[PDB]
Design a protein around this nucleic acid. Structure first.
Ligand SMILES: NC[C@H]1O[C@H](O[C@H]2[C@H](O[C@@H]3O[C@H](CO)[C@@H](O)[C@H](N)[C@H]3O)[C@@H](O)[C@H](N)C[C@@H]2N)[C@H](N)[C@@H](O)[C@@H]1O
Ligand SMILES: [Mg+2]
Ligand SMILES: [Mg+2]
Ligand SMILES: [Mg+2]
Ligand SMILES: [Mg+2]
Ligand SMILES: [Mg+2]
Ligand SMILES: [Mg+2]
Ligand SMILES: [Mg+2]
Ligand SMILES: [Mg+2]
Ligand SMILES: [Mg+2]
Ligand SMILES: [Mg+2]
Ligand SMILES: [Mg+2]
Ligand SMILES: [Mg+2]
Ligand SMILES: [Mg+2]
Ligand SMILES: [Mg+2]
Ligand SMILES: [Mg+2]
Ligand SMILES: [Mg+2]
Ligand SMILES: [Mg+2]
Ligand SMILES: [Mg+2]
Ligand SMILES: [Mg+2]
Ligand SMILES: [Mg+2]
Ligand SMILES: [Mg+2]
Ligand SMILES: [Mg+2]
Ligand SMILES: [Mg+2]
Ligand SMILES: [Mg+2]
Ligand SMILES: [Mg+2]
Ligand SMILES: [Mg+2]
Ligand SMILES: [Mg+2]
Ligand SMILES: [Mg+2]
Ligand SMILES: [Mg+2]
Ligand SMILES: [Mg+2]
Ligand SMILES: [Mg+2]
Ligand SMILES: [Mg+2]
Ligand SMILES: [Mg+2]
Ligand SMILES: [Mg+2]
Ligand SMILES: [Mg+2]
Ligand SMILES: [Mg+2]
Ligand SMILES: [Mg+2]
Ligand SMILES: [Mg+2]
Ligand SMILES: [Mg+2]
Ligand SMILES: [Mg+2]
Ligand SMILES: [Mg+2]
Ligand SMILES: [Mg+2]
Ligand SMILES: [Mg+2]
Ligand SMILES: [Mg+2]
Ligand SMILES: [Mg+2]
Ligand SMILES: [Mg+2]
Ligand SMILES: [Mg+2]
Ligand SMILES: [Mg+2]
Ligand SMILES: [Mg+2]
Ligand SMILES: [Mg+2]
Ligand SMILES: [Mg+2]
Ligand SMILES: [Mg+2]
Ligand SMILES: [Mg+2]
Ligand SMILES: [Mg+2]
Ligand SMILES: [Mg+2]
Ligand SMILES: [Mg+2]
Ligand SMILES: [Mg+2]
Ligand SMILES: [Mg+2]
Ligand SMILES: [Mg+2]
Ligand SMILES: [Mg+2]
Ligand SMILES: [Mg+2]
Ligand SMILES: [Mg+2]
Ligand SMILES: [Mg+2]
Ligand SMILES: [Mg+2]
Ligand SMILES: [Mg+2]
Ligand SMILES: [Mg+2]
Ligand SMILES: [Mg+2]
Ligand SMILES: [Mg+2]
Ligand SMILES: [Mg+2]
Ligand SMILES: [Mg+2]
Ligand SMILES: [Mg+2]
Ligand SMILES: [Mg+2]
Ligand SMILES: [Mg+2]
Ligand SMILES: [Mg+2]
Ligand SMILES: [Mg+2]
Ligand SMILES: [Mg+2]
Ligand SMILES: [Mg+2]
Ligand SMILES: [Mg+2]
Ligand SMILES: [Mg+2]
Ligand SMILES: [Mg+2]
Ligand SMILES: [Mg+2]
Ligand SMILES: [Mg+2]
Ligand SMILES: [Mg+2]
Ligand SMILES: [Mg+2]
Ligand SMILES: [Mg+2]
Ligand SMILES: [Mg+2]
Ligand SMILES: [Mg+2]
Ligand SMILES: [Mg+2]
Ligand SMILES: [Mg+2]
Ligand SMILES: [Mg+2]
Ligand SMILES: [Mg+2]
Ligand SMILES: [Mg+2]
Ligand SMILES: [Mg+2]
Ligand SMILES: [Mg+2]
Ligand SMILES: [Mg+2]
Ligand SMILES: [Mg+2]
Ligand SMILES: [Mg+2]
Ligand SMILES: [Mg+2]
Ligand SMILES: [Mg+2]
Ligand SMILES: [Mg+2]
Ligand SMILES: [Mg+2]
Ligand SMILES: [Mg+2]
Ligand SMILES: [Mg+2]
Ligand SMILES: [Mg+2]
Ligand SMILES: [Mg+2]
Ligand SMILES: [Mg+2]
Ligand SMILES: [Mg+2]
Ligand SMILES: [Mg+2]
Ligand SMILES: [Mg+2]
Ligand SMILES: [Mg+2]
Ligand SMILES: [Mg+2]
Ligand SMILES: [Mg+2]
Ligand SMILES: [Mg+2]
Ligand SMILES: [Mg+2]
Ligand SMILES: [Mg+2]
Ligand SMILES: [Mg+2]
Ligand SMILES: [Mg+2]
Ligand SMILES: [Mg+2]
Ligand SMILES: [Mg+2]
Ligand SMILES: [Mg+2]
Ligand SMILES: [Mg+2]
Ligand SMILES: [Mg+2]
Ligand SMILES: [Mg+2]
Ligand SMILES: [Mg+2]
Ligand SMILES: [Mg+2]
Ligand SMILES: [Mg+2]
Ligand SMILES: [Mg+2]
Ligand SMILES: [Mg+2]
Ligand SMILES: [Mg+2]
Ligand SMILES: [Mg+2]
Ligand SMILES: [Mg+2]
Ligand SMILES: [Mg+2]
Ligand SMILES: [Mg+2]
Ligand SMILES: [Mg+2]
Ligand SMILES: [Mg+2]
Ligand SMILES: [Mg+2]
Ligand SMILES: [Mg+2]
Ligand SMILES: [Mg+2]
Ligand SMILES: [Mg+2]
Ligand SMILES: [Mg+2]
Ligand SMILES: [Mg+2]
Ligand SMILES: [Mg+2]
Ligand SMILES: [Mg+2]
Ligand SMILES: [Mg+2]
Ligand SMILES: [Mg+2]
Ligand SMILES: [Mg+2]
Ligand SMILES: [Mg+2]
Ligand SMILES: [Mg+2]
Ligand SMILES: [Mg+2]
Ligand SMILES: [Mg+2]
Ligand SMILES: [Mg+2]
Ligand SMILES: [Mg+2]
Ligand SMILES: [Mg+2]
Ligand SMILES: [Mg+2]
Ligand SMILES: [Mg+2]
Ligand SMILES: [Mg+2]
Ligand SMILES: [Mg+2]
Ligand SMILES: [Mg+2]
Ligand SMILES: [Mg+2]
Ligand SMILES: [Mg+2]
Ligand SMILES: [Mg+2]
Ligand SMILES: [Mg+2]
Ligand SMILES: [Mg+2]
Ligand SMILES: [Mg+2]
Ligand SMILES: [Mg+2]
Ligand SMILES: [Mg+2]
Ligand SMILES: [Mg+2]
Ligand SMILES: [Mg+2]
Ligand SMILES: [Mg+2]
Ligand SMILES: [Mg+2]
Ligand SMILES: [Mg+2]
Ligand SMILES: [Mg+2]
Ligand SMILES: [Mg+2]
Ligand SMILES: [Mg+2]
Ligand SMILES: [Mg+2]
Ligand SMILES: [Mg+2]
Ligand SMILES: [Mg+2]
Ligand SMILES: [Mg+2]
Ligand SMILES: [Mg+2]
Ligand SMILES: [Mg+2]
Ligand SMILES: [Mg+2]
Ligand SMILES: [Mg+2]
Lengths: 47, 273
RNA sequence: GCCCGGAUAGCUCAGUCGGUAGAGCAGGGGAUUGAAAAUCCCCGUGUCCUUGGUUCGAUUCCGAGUCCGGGCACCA
RNA sequence: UCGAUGUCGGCUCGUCGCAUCCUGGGGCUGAAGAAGGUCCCAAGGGUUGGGCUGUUCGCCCAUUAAAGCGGCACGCGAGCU
RNA sequence: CGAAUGCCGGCAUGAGUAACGAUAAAGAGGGUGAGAAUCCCUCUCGCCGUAAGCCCAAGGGUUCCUACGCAAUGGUCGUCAGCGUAGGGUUAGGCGGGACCUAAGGUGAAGCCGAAAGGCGUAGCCGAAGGGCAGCCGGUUAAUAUUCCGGCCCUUCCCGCAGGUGCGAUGGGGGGACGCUCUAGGCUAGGGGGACCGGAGCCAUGGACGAGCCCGGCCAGAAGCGCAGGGUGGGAGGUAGGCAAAUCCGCCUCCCAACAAGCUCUGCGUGGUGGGGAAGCCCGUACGGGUGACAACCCCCCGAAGCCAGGGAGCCAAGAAAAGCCUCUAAGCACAACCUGCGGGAACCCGUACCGCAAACCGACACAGGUGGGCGGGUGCAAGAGCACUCAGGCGCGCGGGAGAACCCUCGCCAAGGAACUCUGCAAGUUGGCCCCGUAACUUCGGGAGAAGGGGUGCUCCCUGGGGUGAUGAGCCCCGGGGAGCCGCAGUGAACAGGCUCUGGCGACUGUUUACCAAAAACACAGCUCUCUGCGAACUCGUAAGAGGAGGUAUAGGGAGCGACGCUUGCCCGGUGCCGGAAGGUCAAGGGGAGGGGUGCAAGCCCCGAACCGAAGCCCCGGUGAACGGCGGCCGUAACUAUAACGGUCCUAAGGUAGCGAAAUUCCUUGUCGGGUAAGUUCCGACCUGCACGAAAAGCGUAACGACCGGAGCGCUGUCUCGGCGAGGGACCCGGUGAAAUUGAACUGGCCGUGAAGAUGCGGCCUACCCGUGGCAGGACGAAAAGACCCCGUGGAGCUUUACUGCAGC
RNA sequence: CGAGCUAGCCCUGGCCAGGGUGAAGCUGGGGUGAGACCCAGUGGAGGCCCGAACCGGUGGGGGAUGCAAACCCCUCGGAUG
RNA sequence: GUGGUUCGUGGAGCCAUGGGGGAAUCUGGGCGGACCACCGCCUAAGGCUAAGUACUCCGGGUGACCGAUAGCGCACCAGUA
RNA sequence: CGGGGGGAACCUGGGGAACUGAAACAUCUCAGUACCCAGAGGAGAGGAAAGAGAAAUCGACUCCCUGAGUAGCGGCGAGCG
RNA sequence: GUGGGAGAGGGUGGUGGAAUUCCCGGAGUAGCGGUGAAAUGCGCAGAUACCGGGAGGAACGCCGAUGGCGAAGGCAGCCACCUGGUCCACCCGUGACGCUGAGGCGCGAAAGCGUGGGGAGCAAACCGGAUUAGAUACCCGGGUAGUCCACGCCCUAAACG
């Protein structure tokens, strides 16, 4: 039956992407946290 | 007056459709239509601020002329009577003699072919807009400005009208469609006649879908809900209000008056609904 | 089965700070009427449910008993 | 027994008790005969089909030798419903 | 450290056990190889074929093609592979997207708001599966192709030449530009037939050398032309409107054409040319190549839902925008510029492999699930995308061999009976398509209706009616009518394809719902009523700005109840709510200061403070019932009895009206009576003693409707008496691969007792050689889940209110 | 941090085999003083009917360490709203 | 009206300030816990100002600190699979 | 000419919880903590008396010890200080 | 046919004054109302009585008659429009074209009914005050349908002379 992940590349970038994160103070602190932890990807890969 | 239908389905027994006889022109005046953005009852947050709205037929907005005084003196011909979906009345198309086209809201008896005009001049006759102060006492009128130059406000809806009961100083006394006895400024414009399409209040929608065409989604009673939801939610099988009957937001809904008491306009009202 | 009320004139009922208890209707005797009603004038009257106790004195306060009215008997 | 002993009834499948419903053997009889009453022995076997109700029970129809009463976690849901 | 359903890890038990993932199905020969049911090839067999074939879009991201490989991945095997290693492969001015447009929304100069963060917002900008925009056919590669090649076409930019013209834009105007249902005409796609055209070969097995059988008889194409169709008036005069200007557009008037007449645009046909081109045989191709061939290349018919296209009609619920494009003028320039035609030059960036109803996507899996668009052939069955078979094409589902027990699943049939089964005809069965006949109560006159119940249905010959296309004819195609016969158990001969009736409850209806135990009598629904709301509306969201309401205006909008329709919806305003009430009472801050007090020598500074004035609220007066709500008791009485029209009296704000009633409500209860049955706790009809109906939490009815829930009957049945037999897929055996929960350890019997009260484990007896396999489930208080019931905890959380206290709001 | 599931709305597109029923209207006829109205033919309406796709999820059976953390088979509801 | 302080309205000053009213320039003003007197202290409504102080991404020294289930999550291509 | 963004912890400023404790709980506590925001810097804040507060005293600010769990605050409870 | 007449005959559209009620302003005070008599009710929150302004609906005094007109039901301020029936006169035209009339069709007071409107007065039902043995009556205070308009129904009557 229809499950929860219905991949759509524009949705992914439009929602979790770098320009989104930067757009919002909540989002900019995501980037700050993921940098401080040393995450290799800061943002889902998408494409 | 109200086409009926043989009952060849359920819901076609009681269905009732407008009589469209008066309608002369079956597609609108392209320079006079702009698109309108269906809200679905949502505000500029994304939030429903009016319940049970949405769906419903697409519509183009006919821009209509609720100030007639920026054409003072210029007569116009009534070219067509048209169906505006954004209102219960009908719109009359006006061809002015200087060549401008405008939509007026269509009075009762106004027939295609007629000449119409607006101003302190102008015969007291159906279609003519004037400052109230020049309209003889006792005249029924519609599309009244409430304050001068600010646009027609009162008695725009199909069949409605308003009546001049008197003059006092700079103001005249109208009886509004509601029966309120209001002062209005003498310089306010109004056009003479009732609105027409009076038969409108007698249509019988007849089924659920026909409400849905008009953009009205189903409405659920507080009684139908749970206590999280409504002052009336809950209670085992049915149950009466159990408290003074209320809105979803808790305020009482039989008799509780909501008009702000200190409103400046209170000096100008004489009566009620 | 468990808690609540009530029991006062023939009927329906009020009332009591513990000391002489009343209303309406019924009922009795007179009047009025040709005669019945309606009306008018007189009129009583009950051991205030039983049973113990408190007290000088109990319809009145106390605790039980009857019988009647009420409410309850839920979770499995 | 609450770090679980699934709870009415039906179905399936039995098995036991006897305070015996029937069949077998008895005594007394207010036992003429036939048919009963009552009590005694006896548990080998038997102990119907339907209407109503979830019902157990019970009532009713039509039969019968008879249409017994109980126990088995109100027998039986790692057997079904 | 021995315990914490402890933590981490390792290894056991169950066990060679369940399982190896759709019951579409396999068999042999040959090849290869160390090894072959599993890889390749051939032949046979079977399954899909509105797909299980083919083409797009997402998503995936090398899976593509080739060589060399088989450790692991593959539910077995593997020489194979979507796997390992390596090399190769994706080619565009015209396909898609971007150097175009706007949509919701997003963002956002101006501007507004907010403690900060931020929130809004006009223009503008961004934003597409919409709008605009120039490529078709074939060939080629192991792998790409509208991309490379071949052929024939075309667009934009730049520059130049010629001819034309007041040129000129971000401004004005036109256009773009629109719904739903139905539909005309002419075409095309697509298909069928042909005795005509072309073609290897075929005559078996009794017959046929035949007007035999088998195979094919097209594709694209500028201008021109032809057929069909869309768009569209021409001229003048006035002109104050389209935020300047306009010669444009709009508006008035007069004059011509009414018509595609013309002009224009598009479909299709034809067209210089270019391409393709079967069966069959041969070559070995793993996959194609050769030939067939100088292939033929034509007539008829069916015919779209596609095209002409902005076609036509009707209807109400009234159906985007902007650019491209045309027109007008403005600065400005008119040597510019623009328009047309021809020529040269110039034409960028990203995508392109492969999978794509799935072994490559979403589901931990090579998962019986989910996944949008297009194409989807033939024959037959009334039609069709339905059903059966079948083409192209694709597949036989990555364990097999055997056996032919119980038992299970899916399936077939059954003597007599026919619901006796059971909570219930649950399940199965009957019925079943089309044509004709025929069809009741009741009804809102539509229905009920496919009511019900019947008849027909195949093939053969003869005759015969109308239509389409052709020509008015043959031919092909469609719809039939009548007659005579033939065969079988049977002719919608297989497949797809209602069982029907009566009578109650509930809900009017179609709809909607607890994704994953409830689809309903619940919600919704048209409709009826109350109420609020005069517009900067009430109401909602937001601290605000803002916004929805609504670019709406009382025939409107919000809230609430009721819920089509019919006939109706009584009485009570004491209490609560709401509504009204300029008086009176009370009332906070504030005002006011009679009086008092602190200190100082004093002037003074400071503190308290009565009267009186002083909102809303509340008290008080009154209204209000489709506002929250409520709507009695006792005693007596009639010339048989019984009952009580009648009387009396207590109480209340008023004591339940019509209608209905043992009910989705009735405790007693299987009430009593009647109906139905042989028998009826259910069901239907009555009665009324209504524990505890009753009028918009509506009362009582109602045709029609219902995968709702009762009750009855007919029909028919393996539901049952009462089971039997058969089939296939498991179970069983052999070869391959090989889990799980569970598990203190175990050398793990019965009875009667005992024991923490239900013992393999203790006592006494009894029984009992060791170990397995297939079976059944009585026990191990079997497993699973630290009982969800119940209580406890001064545990939690949702909900309510005239609980307390607060806050928003008013 | 989430509306890539799910619920509503907004913008822009797409889809719905085939058959049946036969509303208004229109036309003709009849009727009348004129009408209402009647009949036929035409017409093609509808939360109309039957049934695929598509959307559902009624009843039963199977599954229950599944093929599946909701599936499969039979049956059944809607199918121009 | 409220925050700060030990000060929770308390006899409640001080410091700050959202609202109202609203001065003076040494004989001016604030303060010493309501207020008044007396006696003292201090000069609001502008600004700046090292050091002594806090911390440890970073380098170094040293452990009656661990020794691969420890020690950082990571001794190893880990904020990775 | 400058600003913008980053930085482990440290700093300041604007805003600011609840569990918890009070063996219930509301004032109180937790706590001006967590956390969000703005800003600083190698530190930051603070700072040169309209101060203390009883001495006729002391002299900017910061930091440690002490004063001292004192003075006080406090449903005069828990506790705070 | 011609020329004349009378009339509340009918359909429509307008329009006037008296009065009742409500509201606003003024003035003014203690009662008003009501009946057999009363009470309910209204009134110092300023009633009644009076004056001024306004709103709204219904019915048309005098004329008015025992009168007129209509087939009946019925029809009454005024104005206009449209329209029926009718009478007289003159004796002009048609030439029996007539009477009645089962069925049919149309009209049809009041009440009632549907869907809208409208609602001052009145007023079934209902409430309240009296009266009474009771009083679901007569009288009093309230009061909703209705009465009024449009459209469509109902089709009754002591629809009677
Ligand atoms: N059929 C034609 C006419 O017949 C009569 O008129 C007559 C008319 O009557 C008049 O009608 C009027 C209508 O009521 C009245 O206003 C006069 N009072 C009255 O005298 C006579 O005065 C003429 N002389 C003869 C005329 N035929 C009818 N009455 C009219 O209605 C009708 O239109
Ligand atoms: Mg997941
Ligand atoms: Mg996308
Ligand atoms: Mg890296
Ligand atoms: Mg927005
Ligand atoms: Mg937003
Ligand atoms: Mg729609
Ligand atoms: Mg309405
Ligand atoms: Mg209607
Ligand atoms: Mg609605
Ligand atoms: Mg509702
Ligand atoms: Mg609910
Ligand atoms: Mg809540
Ligand atoms: Mg909520
Ligand atoms: Mg609530
Ligand atoms: Mg409630
Ligand atoms: Mg209830
Ligand atoms: Mg409820
Ligand atoms: Mg008493
Ligand atoms: Mg005598
Ligand atoms: Mg005594
Ligand atoms: Mg005594
Ligand atoms: Mg319980
Ligand atoms: Mg309970
Ligand atoms: Mg237990
Ligand atoms: Mg257990
Ligand atoms: Mg015997
Ligand atoms: Mg004998
Ligand atoms: Mg004898
Ligand atoms: Mg025996
Ligand atoms: Mg039964
Ligand atoms: Mg029992
Ligand atoms: Mg019983
Ligand atoms: Mg028992
Ligand atoms: Mg049991
Ligand atoms: Mg059992
Ligand atoms: Mg079970
Ligand atoms: Mg059981
Ligand atoms: Mg352990
Ligand atoms: Mg093992
Ligand atoms: Mg085993
Ligand atoms: Mg086995
Ligand atoms: Mg096996
Ligand atoms: Mg398999
Ligand atoms: Mg083989
Ligand atoms: Mg096919
Ligand atoms: Mg993947
Ligand atoms: Mg790879
Ligand atoms: Mg391998
Ligand atoms: Mg393997
Ligand atoms: Mg596998
Ligand atoms: Mg590979
Ligand atoms: Mg460029
Ligand atoms: Mg743009
Ligand atoms: Mg923004
Ligand atoms: Mg696009
Ligand atoms: Mg293109
Ligand atoms: Mg081309
Ligand atoms: Mg090609
Ligand atoms: Mg390929
Ligand atoms: Mg030009
Ligand atoms: Mg064909
Ligand atoms: Mg030939
Ligand atoms: Mg032969
Ligand atoms: Mg030959
Ligand atoms: Mg201009
Ligand atoms: Mg068009
Ligand atoms: Mg068109
Ligand atoms: Mg110039
Ligand atoms: Mg490609
Ligand atoms: Mg594949
Ligand atoms: Mg699929
Ligand atoms: Mg598809
Ligand atoms: Mg597989
Ligand atoms: Mg799959
Ligand atoms: Mg997968
Ligand atoms: Mg068929
Ligand atoms: Mg097709
Ligand atoms: Mg049989
Ligand atoms: Mg039978
Ligand atoms: Mg049944
Ligand atoms: Mg069935
Ligand atoms: Mg019948
Ligand atoms: Mg029927
Ligand atoms: Mg019919
Ligand atoms: Mg039939
Ligand atoms: Mg029927
Ligand atoms: Mg045959
Ligand atoms: Mg068949
Ligand atoms: Mg089928
Ligand atoms: Mg069939
Ligand atoms: Mg059928
Ligand atoms: Mg019943
Ligand atoms: Mg329903
Ligand atoms: Mg339904
Ligand atoms: Mg529901
Ligand atoms: Mg569910
Ligand atoms: Mg759930
Ligand atoms: Mg259903
Ligand atoms: Mg209704
Ligand atoms: Mg607000
Ligand atoms: Mg606002
Ligand atoms: Mg708005
Ligand atoms: Mg708006
Ligand atoms: Mg509403
Ligand atoms: Mg309801
Ligand atoms: Mg009816
Ligand atoms: Mg009341
Ligand atoms: Mg009240
Ligand atoms: Mg009151
Ligand atoms: Mg007050
Ligand atoms: Mg009162
Ligand atoms: Mg008697
Ligand atoms: Mg009752
Ligand atoms: Mg009854
Ligand atoms: Mg009964
Ligand atoms: Mg009841
Ligand atoms: Mg009962
Ligand atoms: Mg009954
Ligand atoms: Mg009522
Ligand atoms: Mg009610
Ligand atoms: Mg009923
Ligand atoms: Mg019914
Ligand atoms: Mg149903
Ligand atoms: Mg039956
Ligand atoms: Mg069987
Ligand atoms: Mg078998
Ligand atoms: Mg034992
Ligand atoms: Mg031992
Ligand atoms: Mg021992
Ligand atoms: Mg065994
Ligand atoms: Mg067992
Ligand atoms: Mg067990
Ligand atoms: Mg526990
Ligand atoms: Mg406690
Ligand atoms: Mg608690
Ligand atoms: Mg969504
Ligand atoms: Mg149709
Ligand atoms: Mg339908
Ligand atoms: Mg399709
Ligand atoms: Mg779906
Ligand atoms: Mg199902
Ligand atoms: Mg379900
Ligand atoms: Mg099942
Ligand atoms: Mg099972
Ligand atoms: Mg799980
Ligand atoms: Mg259907
Ligand atoms: Mg403080
Ligand atoms: Mg305190
Ligand atoms: Mg203080
Ligand atoms: Mg001081
Ligand atoms: Mg201040
Ligand atoms: Mg001074
Ligand atoms: Mg100071
Ligand atoms: Mg000081
Ligand atoms: Mg001092
Ligand atoms: Mg000082
Ligand atoms: Mg420093
Ligand atoms: Mg290690
Ligand atoms: Mg480690
Ligand atoms: Mg080691
Ligand atoms: Mg290790
Ligand atoms: Mg570690
Ligand atoms: Mg690493
Ligand atoms: Mg701070
Ligand atoms: Mg700040
Ligand atoms: Mg907060
Ligand atoms: Mg503590
Ligand atoms: Mg606590
Ligand atoms: Mg505690
Ligand atoms: Mg607590
Ligand atoms: Mg604190
Ligand atoms: Mg430093
Ligand atoms: Mg103290
Ligand atoms: Mg205390
Ligand atoms: Mg503190
Ligand atoms: Mg003559
Ligand atoms: Mg009548
Ligand atoms: Mg009437
Ligand atoms: Mg009256
Ligand atoms: Mg009398
Ligand atoms: Mg009234
Ligand atoms: Mg008369």
């Amino acid at each position: 039956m229809k499950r929860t992940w219905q991949p759509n590349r524009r949705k992914r970038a439009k929602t979790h992407g770098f320009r989104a994160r930067m757009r919002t103070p909540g989002g900019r602190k995501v980037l700050k946290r993921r940098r401080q932890k040393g995450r290799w990807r800061l943002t889902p890969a998408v494409r | 007056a109200v086409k009926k239908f043989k009952p060849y389905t359920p819901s076609r027994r009681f269905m009732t459709v407008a009589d469209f006889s008066e309608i002369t022109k079956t597609e609108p005046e392209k320079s006079l239509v702009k698109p309108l953005k269906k809200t679905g009852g949502r505000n500029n947050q994304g939030r429903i601020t009016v319940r049970f709205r949405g769906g419903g037929h697409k519509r183009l907005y006919r821009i209509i002329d609720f100030k007639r005084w920026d054409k003072v003196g210029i007569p116009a011909k009534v070219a067509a009577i048209e169906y505006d979906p954004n209102r219960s009345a009908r719109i009359a198309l006006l061809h002015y003699v200087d060549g401008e086209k405008r939509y007026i809201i269509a009075p009762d008896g106004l027939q295609v072919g007629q000449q119409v005009v607006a101003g302190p001049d102008a015969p007291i006759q159906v279609g003519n807009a004037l400052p109230l102060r020049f309209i003889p006492v006792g005249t029924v009128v519609h599309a009244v400005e409430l304050e001068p130059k600010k646009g027609a406000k009162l008695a725009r809806a199909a069949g409605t009208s308003a009546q001049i009961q008197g003059r006092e100083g700079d103001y005249v006394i109208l009886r509004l469609p509601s029966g309120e006895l209001r002062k209005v400024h003498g310089e306010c414009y109004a056009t003479v006649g009732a609105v027409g399409n009076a038969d409108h209040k007698n249509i019988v929608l007849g089924k659920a879908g026909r409400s849905r065409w008009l953009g009205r989604r189903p409405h659920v009673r507080g009684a139908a809900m749970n206590p999280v939801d409504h002052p009336h939610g809950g209670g085992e099988g049915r149950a009466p209000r159990g408290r003074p009957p209320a809105s979803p937001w808790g305020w009482q809904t039989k008799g509780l008056k909501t008009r702000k008491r200190r409103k400046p306009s209170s000096r100008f009202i004489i009566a009620r609904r």
